[PDB]
Amino acid sequence: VSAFRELAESAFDLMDDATPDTRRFPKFLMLGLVPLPNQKPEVYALNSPYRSNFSQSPIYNGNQLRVKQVRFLYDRLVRLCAADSFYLLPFYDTPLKITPSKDRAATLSQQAIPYYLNYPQLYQYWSYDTYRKGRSQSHPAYFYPNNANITPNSDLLHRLDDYSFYRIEGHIGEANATALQRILDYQQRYNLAFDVITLKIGNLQSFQDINISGQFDDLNADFGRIK
Amino acid sequence: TTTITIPNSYPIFTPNQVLTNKDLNRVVTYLDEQNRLTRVYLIGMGIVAGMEVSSIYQPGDVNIVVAPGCGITSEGYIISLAETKLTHYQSGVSVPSALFAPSEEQTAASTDQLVELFEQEGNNRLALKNLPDENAFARFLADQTLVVVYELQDQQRDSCLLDCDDTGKDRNFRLRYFLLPRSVPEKLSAEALLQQGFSREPLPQQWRDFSINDIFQAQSSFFQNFF
C-alpha cells in the first residue's frame, strides 16, 4: 500500500503533452459555465469542466524529471507484485544483524530494504535519487552484492546523524535464551541504546521462565555475586 | 485532417526574374507558420491569464462581465481581452460551420442557430435590461457556456469605392461572442465541440466507453475513490 501511495501522490502533478495536436480548438476559446446571478466567480480551481485549460511541453516546472520518476515508480510496483518477492531463507542460515534506518513516516524510497524480500532483483529499482548517483549498491539493507569493494559493516562504524530507527533481523524461530544473548552482545559490540524483554503467549506459567524476562536481575546479580 | 506540418520550401530569388503572386505568398505563409509553430510546439496551448465570467443582475443593470487576460489558440493566434461587458443580445443568428473548423477543413456543413451577445445596441439587438423579471434572466442564463471566436475575412479593394488602387485583398480579423448550450442532442453544444476536437484518433481500448468530459473528470475524482 505504501508504494501505491508514493506513486499516486506524484503522478497527480505531471503534465507532459509530448506531441501536440493543432486541431483541438483551432480558432476559438471556450470559457466555463455562466454562474448564477450575483454569485462570486470561481477563483481557486485550476481545471473547470468546460474550459480550455492550459497544456505544455515537458520542459517547464521540472517535468523533464517527473516524466521519469513516475515511470521508475510504476515499474517498481510491478516487481513488488510478483510470485517470488516474499522469499524467506531457513532460519539457521541467517546470523543476527542490526541496521539503522529511517522511521515509518519517511517515504518508502528512503527506508532500509527489509530482508524477507528477494534482494538480488529488487536492490536495483528501490530509490530513484540513489539510482541517479550510482549508489544503489550501498543502500542500508541486510544483504550486500558480490564483486563490489564494500566494507562489511560500514553503517555502524561511521557517524550516525540521520538515522533514528534500529531495524533488527535474524531472530525468528530460534530459542529464547540464544536470541536474547546474541542481541545483548550486539548491543555491547557497537554501543547502541535500547532495552530488551521477552514474554510468553498462554495462560499457564512454566518453570523458571521468569529468569528470562527483564526482571529478577536486580536480584539475580547479587545471587551470582555471592555464588 | 492532420496536425500542421513544418514547412519545407520557400522561394529563392535571382536577378532577372519575372515576379508572380506565389513568390511572395509562399514566403509570407512560411514566416507566419514559423512564428505560430514556435508558439504552439514549444510553449503550449490555452488560457494563460484567467478570464472569469460573471453575471450581474440589478434593477437598472443586467449584464455579463468578462475579466481581462490573454490566451493562445490551438493554431497560434493570440487572444487578449480587457473587461468586456455584454448587455445586448440577438437570437436565432445563423453562423457558418467553417467558423469552428480547421483551416484546411474541406467538407460540407450547414449553418447553425446561435444566440449572440453584444456590447452595444442595434437594429435586432435587444437589451437584457428589458427582460420581464430576474427569474427570466436566470432561466435565460442556465446550463449554457460562452465561446469567443476569432474570425478572419478578406476585404476586396475597389478603386470605384475611393480606394487608392484595386486588384487585391486585405486580410483582417475580429472577435465574436456566442452563448452555446452545454448539451443538446441534435444541435451544436459544448460536448459536441469537445468530441469533434479531441476524438480524432483511436483511443486505447479501456477508454472507448467514456465521453470527453468523463475521460477528463475521471482523473480529478480519482482520490475520492480508490483510496
Next chain:
Amino acid sequence: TTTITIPNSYPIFTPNQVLTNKDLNRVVTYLDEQNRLTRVYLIGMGIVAGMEVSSIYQPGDVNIVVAPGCGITSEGYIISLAETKLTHYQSGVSVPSALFAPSEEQTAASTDQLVELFEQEGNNRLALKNLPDENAFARFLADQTLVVVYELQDQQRDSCLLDCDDTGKDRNFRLRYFLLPRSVPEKLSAEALLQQGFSREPLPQQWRDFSINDIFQAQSSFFQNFF
C-alpha cells in the same frame, strides 16, 4: 568560425525605386534569423521529447525502430519524428563533410564513407531480411550510434516547359539517417563530432587532459568516488 550574431540591417523601400534580388534576400534572411535566434537563445537546444532507439530481430521482422518525438538542433531547426522503422541499408555512401560544418563556414570538403538506412526497398538498397542469421545482425549493430541529419538543398527551377521565362531556385530540406561508428582513429566517428563541436575555445587549465565524453562523464561519476 563564430557564434551567430543579431542582424542589425534590413533595407527600406521608397517610391520610384528599382528593386534588386538582394534587396528581398536581405529581409527574408533577417526575419528567418530573428525567429531562429528567439528559439535558440531564449529556450535552448536539443532533444525535447524522447527518441529512444530499439532493434528487433524476429524470424519475420528485422528492423530498427525510433520512437516519436520532437527536438531543436543547435541552429533553431525543429526536427519532428513519428514511429520511424528502418529496414534496408546501403553501405559505402559518399557524404560531404561540409554537411556537418557550420553554415557560416564556406569551405568545401572531401567526402567520407558512411552507411545509410532506409525504410523502403530501392535499387541498391539491401533489405535487412536477407542477413544470414541473428549473429550477423548482432555484429551489424555493435558499438555504433544513430545520427539524424537535416540537409539543405538549393534546387534550380525549370525554365522552359510551357513558357520561356526566367526562374529562380528554391530551398528544400531533407532528413537522412546515418549509422556511425563510436570510435575510429582515422574515420568519422561520434567522438570526432563531439571534439569538433565543443572544443572550439580553450577550457580552464585544470580540464586540459580530458576528452569531451570524459569531461562529461566525470560529473556523473562524481558521487561514486569522492564520498
